[PDB]
Amino acid sequence: MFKMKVEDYFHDILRERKIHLTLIDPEEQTPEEAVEIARAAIRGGTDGIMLGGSTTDSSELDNTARALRENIDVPIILFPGNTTGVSRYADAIFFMSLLNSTNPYWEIGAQALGAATVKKMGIEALPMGYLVVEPGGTVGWVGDTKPVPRNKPDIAAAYAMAAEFLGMRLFYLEAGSGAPEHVPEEMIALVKRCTDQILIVGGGIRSGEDAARVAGAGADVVVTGTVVNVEDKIREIVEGMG
Amino acid sequence: FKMKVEDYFHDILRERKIHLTLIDPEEQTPEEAVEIARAAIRGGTDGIMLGGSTTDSSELDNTARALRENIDVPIILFPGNTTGVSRYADAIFFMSLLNSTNPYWEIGAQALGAATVKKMGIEALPMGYLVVEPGGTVGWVGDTKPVPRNKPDIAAAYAMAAEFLGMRLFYLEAGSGAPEHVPEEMIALVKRCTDQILIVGGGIRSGEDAARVAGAGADVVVTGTVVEDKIREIVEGMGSVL
Amino acid sequence: FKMKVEDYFHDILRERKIHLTLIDPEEQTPEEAVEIARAAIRGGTDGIMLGGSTTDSSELDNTARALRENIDVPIILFPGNTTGVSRYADAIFFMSLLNSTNPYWEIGAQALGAATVKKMGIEALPMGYLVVEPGGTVGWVGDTKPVPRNKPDIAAAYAMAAEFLGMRLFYLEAGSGAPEHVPEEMIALVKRCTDQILIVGGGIRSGEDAARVAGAGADVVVTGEDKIREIVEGMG
Amino acid sequence: FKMKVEDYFHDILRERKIHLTLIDPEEQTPEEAVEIARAAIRGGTDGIMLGGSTTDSSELDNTARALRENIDVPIILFPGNTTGVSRYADAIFFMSLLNSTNPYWEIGAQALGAATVKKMGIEALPMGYLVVEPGGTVGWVGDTKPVPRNKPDIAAAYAMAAEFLGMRLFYLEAGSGAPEHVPEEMIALVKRCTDQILIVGGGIRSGEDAARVAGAGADVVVTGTVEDKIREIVEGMG
Amino acid sequence: FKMKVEDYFHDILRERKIHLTLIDPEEQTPEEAVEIARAAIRGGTDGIMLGGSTTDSSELDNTARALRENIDVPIILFPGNTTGVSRYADAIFFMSLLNSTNPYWEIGAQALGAATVKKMGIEALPMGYLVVEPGGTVGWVGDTKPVPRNKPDIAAAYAMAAEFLGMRLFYLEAGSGAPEHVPEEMIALVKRCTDQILIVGGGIRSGEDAARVAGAGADVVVTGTVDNVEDKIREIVEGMG
Amino acid sequence: MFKMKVEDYFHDILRERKIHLTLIDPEEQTPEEAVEIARAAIRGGTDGIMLGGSTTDSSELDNTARALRENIDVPIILFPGNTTGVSRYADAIFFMSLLNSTNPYWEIGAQALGAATVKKMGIEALPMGYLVVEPGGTVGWVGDTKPVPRNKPDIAAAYAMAAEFLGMRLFYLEAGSGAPEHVPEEMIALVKRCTDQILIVGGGIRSGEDAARVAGAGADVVVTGTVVENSDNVEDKIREIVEGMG
């Protein structure tokens, strides 16, 4: 349960330091195990929990979101990969467009289908451009993307400027979960130079030095999974960001 | 409900045709949906289909549980996705939207929810789903090229292809609330070319609508609610043709 | 101009509704556009949209600088092809064609021109652009699936998604020279569902056309002598 | 060949893995194809697959007829286009190319050929066809998004989806001439997730390749004439 | 036939307009197709088009062999699948389905069939193929957005692009069985906008249909045999006169 | 300011030698500097100027083309990356279909959008198949292509024959601007063998050696930028490149 608005929470943090978010996949473990992962990451210094996977079991995301809501005090932010990934127990939702998908369903179609449910639940919705970078991982394939090549910083900055002009105040550079190498520092730095978006970067950020370089390159938010204890992994990532 | 839904279908089809009542879990409340279902059962329906609709998330699980505890016919998930899944249903129509041009509705959504369907042990009925002109909201949202009412050969060829891929049920869909149901000529040609269980839905309002559709060769007639009298006239219509 | 176009919109709407006049830079001449625009300001238009349906654009920057020098009304770019960006306009309808099947009109062209829009100082109005059936030519070139007129729920869904992604303006488009305007039931449902500046254009010829459209909930009416005087009073 | 091909498969899999020999009817004359097939059978192949990018179809019928008259293992059509259906075969892999972005290869070409498959008496085996990185020429022509080699979970999700749609055969395709066959990890997870007959092809040239692919959990190994070579491959599967 | 089909076309077009009779090899025996063609040629038809169908290749070569032996007008392939090429034809309409959303029908199948077309030495006529509303079965199977009957400038724009890409022939297709042939206004605007040999087919069932289509500016009218073939073809060719 | 048809001009040159064209982006310099760049390349022996890039600012394509039209005597050929890339002042346009895009807009859509403008300006239109080869560069990414793999020359040959049978008398093998490697020799040679198009090769050509291998493998037209950034360009590099081809 997080009363305050997540977006102002983000701005409060950013006047002193960078934000870390921990991504939890609801299928990958029980709600109770999710609570334990989340507590470990909070003891590691994480600033919030992103919740999202690939599930249509509505009760199952809800059981995780509700369990987290009753046991942690940092925001629960929905990060949906399907349209059913909206839960009333969460504090906010990254309402994103998959910008470099060639499939209209991932650009706007899923969003139109889910919009009414987001409105009726009254959950704070943060507008986000979502850009998959090479290699792109599972989301780059399932979302029918053309991953931005690592050597094309200019493509990423043009989509960010475009996305910002359309009103997406958050921008997410995604190398894909498990990516061997994280989003290049060259591309993070050019994007941050070109827009005033809250700049989010995820994928392949494993070590404290990975996080120092992503943070040093201009990322406002760093996103990581919990593959490794979990507390040590997160705290070392948080220390690298500092 | 206990026995297999597909076995129950074949047992009915020994004597007469099957009627199913489509309930959208967003058009009413779980308890209002229970009375509608009881009204349809009083009218002679053989099962409840559930049901659109993209709407909410928990609104589906709540309707399936309420109905399950108060009726004795099966509850069959009719996903307008394959992104619905409730544990309280007895079976799911596992459909491919055959004449979509978007691979996401052909196979992509089905793959994203296959693990959830496997995780629950819910009976999965393999179904080819074919949108017929005009096609309604699903034909537009599903990126379909609706089969023209004057091209029954196209419908038959898609039904034969679906059959050779293992889809034992085939669903001709005029669209919810369509002005005219699927033409009798097209129902009849599909039934001739194929051994599938042939399901027809969309715009079947009156007993005469139901008699023409069943007498053209439908094994299953799907209608919505728009009263026990209405469903009873439809069932009597289906029976006059025996 | 010397004012933000979006406040100028908000001021007008806390007491009335907005009309904008759409001029194609290639069909006129700079002066004939300065005249067709000035004759429109007499009929009571609140601003001039510049937009070329075709792909030609040699006369855009010349129509822009011309209009910039003789009118006090804002000049808003309504990009048709890609080039439709000039240093002399006061703002841009920076829009995504939401129901296109071509990603080039959803995001691609917007990415190509974004650095130029930012290099110049042009105020960017973030806008969702929905083509409504029958759609005219824009529905075709745009590779759209035009929204059916009897499905206002589909248009409302796209409007709500558009606003959750941060587009504060929403444009309902029937296509230039459409036989009808966007249906009133569709305008009203979208207006109920979002807080967007709701814009409606295409097929609005008469003061009577512009009364049902404005009366159904549109904040901005777009049309393309002073029969716009007839139109401006229809919105009263 | 008298017995239903699908039951033949199930009978073999009670005891060992199946090997199939892929022959392109356009890469040699019918008589040479009979020679190749009989040599593959002497090496222990269990069946002939007949397929390719067909351009002319009298060649497919002449090869299939020559094979039907001179061998005693089944002839299974593996059609590259709707062109590829001959009455002289015993069965057909009736397949959907699952990770194509083109409806024509997902269902369209299948719908165009269905009436012909029905009019012939030909046993139709329902099959999900999944192209894996790198994917060869079929991956590029088929407008596929090849499944990355490090994404076995994507393949398993497609196999499960195909299974729930009634496709009882599943074919993991690395592409003809692939430098590396389908990863063992990916074969293993598909096999653990579904009850399909699991078929793997592309880049399988040695007895060691075949041993890795069958040991990882393939039921059927497909190769194409790389008696000595087939024997080496079949014995690697042993 | 021995002479280039394309030169033959230009010869006729100096004097009058061209008629082609479309035969589908699947719907009769080759013997019967020779009789159909001979009857059509006794009507004023200028050539036989083979195609329209998507199945089996063996039947096409037999049909093309039989006609080449028994007629003196060109045999022109109008293929449906990348299979439908036979060495017994005088020419092929090498088409791109231009208003398909599917790359396979724009270039893909053409790239699969091209080496075969080159293997035979068959004259290939470069052709843009535009499906016009309603569009028939080809417009649905080919994943097209049919040009609306009331947007002739969209048709002209595609015809002008096809011309600039080298497609010297252009086919406006209303679809087999269309209730109305392509509109005269749309035929006329394409002809005014390009130098292409303009071909029009679908929904042309009477001498009056053919008169209005040819009169609106078509260079080639394509019809089927709408036994009584000779009389009917005669009605169509005289309608174009 | 080139009177004469550029395609004629091309066949006339290919009677004796191979053609080189210099690609200039109207956005990365002023019309004056562009003129200086072109005169530089021309003295090092280029046969024409291609105007390319993704044109943004409405008029400086027009301004660059007109400035070149008045000051040079080899053809100016538009190499457009999007709708606007058309101007009175060029002598010819490469009227291209992006053959291996999966998006109809890049295959025929943009072309039909711009066709009337081409005709209205009387600009000479050269019918061209355009084929993106791995890696493909920014053009192959914006154009939603499946780049042809460097080890699938038979795919490129099939597309070239298809495009020839469709009337595209010119064929462009494109590795992508900035590509680390030019199109493979093996693939250039097979395309040259299979068709009789004017065969143009561009992308990743940085040296006399590169241009020698590309021309020697079968290219009729070699396309490069200036490579050098400061001139130094007229030609030194271009002369090295034009001499490598001979």
Domain boundaries of chain E, sorted by first residue: 1-241
Q: How far is CA C80 from the centre of its chain?
A: 11
* Burial E54-72, CB ≥16 within 10 A → b, else e: bbbbebbbbbbebbbeebe
User: B157 vs D118: CB contact, 8 Å cut-off?
Assistant: no
What is the residue-wise DSSP string for F61-99? HHHHHHHHHTT--S-EEE--SSSS---TT-SEEEEEEET
How many angstroms separate the CA atoms of E125 and B131, rounded? 38
Which pair of tokens denotes residue E194? 């390009």
- The nearest CA of chain A is from the CA of C46 a distance in Å of 23
Which pair of tokens denotes residue E218? 């078509």
How many angstroms separate the CA atoms of B112 and B117, rounded? 10
List residues bridging with D198 in a β-sheet: D170
How many angstroms separate the CA atoms of F65 and F61, rounded? 6
Strands E75-78 and A221-224: unpaired
* Burial C155-182, CB ≥16 within 10 A → b, else e: bbbbbbbbbbbbbbbbbbbbbbebeebb
How many angstroms separate the CA atoms of F159 and C183, rounded? 47
Strands E91-97 and F221-224: unpaired
Which of D101, D114, D126 lies nearest to residue B157, judging by beta carbons?
D114
* Cβ-based contacts of F84 with chain C (< 8 Å): 55, 57, 81-83
The count of CB pairs under 8 A between chains D and F is 11
Give yes or no for a contact between B221 and B19, defined as CB atoms under 8 angstroms apart: yes
User: F149 vs D143: CB contact, 8 Å cut-off?
Assistant: no
Question: What separation in angstroms does the CA of A41 have from each of A36, D54, D205, E19?
Answer: 9, 58, 48, 78
For the domain made up of E1-241, the CATH class stated in words is: alpha beta
List residues bridging with B20 in a β-sheet: B222
Give the burial class of C14: count Cβ atoms within 10 A of its Cβ; 0-12 exposed, 13-18 middle, 19 or more buried.
exposed
Report the CATH superfamily, name and number, of domain A1-242.
Answer: FMN-linked oxidoreductases (3.20.20.390)
Question: What separation in angstroms does the CA of E177 have from each of A166, B185, E135, E139?
Answer: 47, 18, 9, 12
Nearest C-alpha in D relative to E53: D112
Q: DSSP H helical segments within chain A, as ranges?
A: 6-14, 31-43, 58-69, 104, 110-121, 137-142, 153-165, 185-194, 208-216, 230-241
- The nearest CA of chain F is from the CA of E36 a distance in Å of 30
Mutate to test the interface with E, among B101, B131, B133, B145 (most CBs of E within 10 A): B145
N-to-C CA span, chain D: 25
Q: Which chains share 3+ C-beta pairs under 8 angstroms with A? A: B, C, D, F
Mutate to test the interface with C, among B54, B140, B141, B143 (most CBs of C within 10 A): B140
* Cβ-based contacts of E151 with chain C (< 8 Å): 137, 140
Strands C91-97 and C75-77: parallel
- The nearest CA of chain F is from the CA of A50 a distance in Å of 31
CA angle A103, A108, A113 (to 5 degrees): 115
Give yes or no for a contact between D158 and D98, defined as CB atoms under 8 angstroms apart: yes
How many angstroms separate the CA atoms of C8 and C45, rounded? 13
Reference F156, options F188, F196, F126; nearest CA is: F188
Residues of chain A whose C-beta is under 8 A from some C-beta in C? 95-97, 99-102, 104, 107-108, 111-116, 118-119, 125, 127-128, 155, 158-159, 161-163, 165-169, 194
Reference F199, options F223, F170, F226, F178; nearest CA is: F170
Which of B101, B107, B158 lies nearest to residue D111, judging by beta carbons?
B158
Query: Which DSSP category does E181 fall into?
Result: P
Which pair of tokens denotes residue F156? 């490129």
What is the residue-wise DSSP string for chain D? --S-HHHHHHHHHTTS-EEEEEE-TTSS-HHHHHHHHHHHHHTT--EEEEEE--S-SHHHHHHHHHHHHH--S-EEEEESSTT---TTSSEEEEEEETTBS-HIIIIIHHHHHHHHHHHTT-EEEEEEEEEBTT-HHHHHHTTB-PBPTT-HHHHHHHHHHHHHTT--EEEEE--TT-SSPSPHHHHHHHHHH--SEEEEESS--SHHHHHHHHHTT-SEEEE----HHHHHHHHHH-
Collapsed DSSP state (helix, strand, coil) of residue A55: coil
Give yes or no for a contact between F169 and F197, defined as CB atoms under 8 angstroms apart: yes
User: C154 vs B141: CB contact, 8 Å cut-off?
Assistant: yes
* Burial F160-185, CB ≥16 within 10 A → b, else e: bbbbbbbbbbbbbbbbbbebeebbbb
List residues bridging with A128 in a β-sheet: A96, A170
Question: What separation in angstroms does the CA of C157 have from each of A79, D82, F24, F222?
Answer: 20, 41, 46, 52
Question: In one letter, which amino acid is E135?
Answer: G
Q: Which chains share 3+ C-beta pairs under 8 angstroms with C? A: A, B, E, F
Contacts of D181 (CB under 8 A, 6+ apart): D174, D200, D202, D203, D204, D209, D212, D213
- The nearest CA of chain D is from the CA of F51 a distance in Å of 32
For the domain made up of D1-238, the CATH class stated in words is: alpha beta
How many angstroms separate the CA atoms of B145 and B158, rounded? 13
Which pair of tokens denotes residue F124? 């000479």
How many angstroms separate the CA atoms of E24 and E224, rounded? 9
- In this structure, which CATH number among 3.20.20.390, 3.90.1170.10, 3.40.980.10, 3.40.30.10 belongs to the domain F1-246? 3.20.20.390
Which of E101, E124, E127 lies nearest to residue F104, judging by beta carbons?
E101
Which of B60, B84, B104 lies nearest to residue A103, judging by beta carbons?
B104
Residue labelled with tokens 């904040």: C219
Collapsed DSSP state (helix, strand, coil) of residue E108: helix
Contacts of B162 (CB under 8 A, 6+ apart): B96, B98, B128, B130, B170, B196, D107
Reference C73, options C15, C20, C23; nearest CA is: C20
N-to-C CA span, chain C: 26
What was the elucidation method?
A: X-ray
Give yes or no for a contact between E87 and E122, defined as CB atoms under 8 angstroms apart: yes
How many angstroms separate the CA atoms of F77 and F94, rounded? 7
How many angstroms separate the CA atoms of D105 and D99, rounded? 9
Residues of chain F whose C-beta is under 8 A from some C-beta in D? 102, 146, 148-149, 152, 154-155
Reference A23, options A202, A195, A161, A185; nearest CA is: A202
Contacts of D104 (CB under 8 A, 6+ apart): E102, E104, E105, E143
What is the residue-wise DSSP string for E15-73? TS-EEEEEE-GGGS-HHHHHHHHHHHHHTT--EEEEES--S-SHHHHHHHHHHHHH--S
How many angstroms separate the CA atoms of A105 and A124, rounded? 23
Contacts of D231 (CB under 8 A, 6+ apart): D42, D43, D44
User: E167 vs F167: CB contact, 8 Å cut-off?
Assistant: yes
* Cβ-based contacts of F120 with chain C (< 8 Å): 56
Which pair of tokens denotes residue B89? 């249903």
List residues bridging with A132 in a β-sheet: A174
Task: Centre a 10 Å sphere on the Cβ of residue C62 and count the other Cβ atoms it contains.
Answer: 17
Nearest C-alpha in E relative to D62: E58
User: C94 vs A165: CB contact, 8 Å cut-off?
Assistant: yes
Q: Helices D30-42 & D228-237, crossing angle to 10 degrees?
A: 40
- The nearest CA of chain A is from the CA of D159 a distance in Å of 15
How many angstroms separate the CA atoms of D192 and F160, rounded? 45
User: D164 vs B94: CB contact, 8 Å cut-off?
Assistant: yes
* Cβ-based contacts of D104 with chain E (< 8 Å): 102, 104-105, 143
Which of C101, C140, C143 lies nearest to residue E154, judging by beta carbons?
C140
Q: Which helix (H) or strand (E) holds E131?
A: strand E123-131
* Burial F194-231, CB ≥16 within 10 A → b, else e: bbebbbbbbbbbbebebbbbbbebbbbbbbbbbbeeeb
Which of E101, E140, E143 lies nearest to residue B154, judging by beta carbons?
E140
- What was the resolution (in A) of this experimentally determined structure? 2.4
Which pair of tokens denotes residue B223? 């209608």
Which of B61, B112, B120 lies nearest to residue A82, judging by beta carbons?
B112
* Binding residue ranges of A for sn-glycerol 1-phosphate: 172-178, 203-204, 225-226
Which pair of tokens denotes residue F183? 């199109």
How many angstroms separate the CA atoms of B116 and B129, rounded? 21
Contacts of C3 (CB under 8 A, 6+ apart): C74
* Cβ-based contacts of A82 with chain D (< 8 Å): none
Give yes or no for a contact between A201 and A221, defined as CB atoms under 8 angstroms apart: yes
What is the residue-wise DSSP string for chain B? --S-HHHHHHHHHTTS-EEEEEE-TTSS-HHHHHHHHHHHHHTT---EEE------SHHHHHHHHHHHTT-SS-EEE--SSS----TT-SEEEEEEETTBSSHIIIIIHHHHHHHHHHHTT-EEEEEEEEEBSS-HHHHHHTTB-PBPTT-HHHHHHHHHHHHHTT--EEEEE--TT-SSPSPHHHHHHHHHH--SEEEEESS--SHHHHHHHHHHT-SEEEE----HHHHHHHHHHHHHT-
Task: Centre a 10 Å sphere on the Cβ of residue E7 and count the other Cβ atoms it contains.
Answer: 9
Nearest C-alpha in F relative to C81: F83
User: F158 vs E98: CB contact, 8 Å cut-off?
Assistant: no
Contacts of E214 (CB under 8 A, 6+ apart): E17, E221, E239, E240
Cis (ω within 30 of 0) for the bond into B53? yes
Contacts of E196 (CB under 8 A, 6+ apart): E128, E159, E162, E163, E167, E168, E169, E170, E190
* Cβ-based contacts of F141 with chain A (< 8 Å): 146, 148-149, 152, 155
How many angstroms separate the CA atoms of C30 and D2, rounded? 83
How many angstroms separate the CA atoms of E221 and E232, rounded? 14
Task: Please state the φ and ψ torsions of residue C189, each to the nearest 5 degrees.
Answer: -65, -40
Maximum pairwise Cα distance, chain B: 44
How many angstroms separate the CA atoms of C132 and C224, rounded? 18
Residue labelled with tokens 């005891």: D15
Q: With touching defined as 3+ CB pairs under 8 A, do chains A and C touch?
A: yes
Collapsed DSSP state (helix, strand, coil) of residue C18: strand
Q: Which helix (H) or strand (E) holds A5?
A: none
Which pair of tokens denotes residue E24? 């589908």
Mutate to test the interface with E, among F107, F108, F111 (most CBs of E within 10 A): F108
- The nearest CA of chain D is from the CA of A180 a distance in Å of 11
User: A162 vs C107: CB contact, 8 Å cut-off?
Assistant: yes
Residues of chain E whose C-beta is under 8 A from some C-beta in C? 101, 145, 151, 153-154
Q: Which chains share 3+ C-beta pairs under 8 angstroms with B? A: A, C, D, E
Which CATH code for domain C1-236? 3.20.20.390
B24 known member of a binding site: yes
Contacts of F142 (CB under 8 A, 6+ apart): C108, C112, F54, F81
List residues bridging with E48 in a β-sheet: E21, E75
Q: Which helix (H) or strand (E) holds C31?
A: helix C30-43
List residues bridging with B96 in a β-sheet: B128
User: B84 vs A120: CB contact, 8 Å cut-off?
Assistant: no
Which of C101, C145, C151 lies nearest to residue B137, judging by beta carbons?
C151
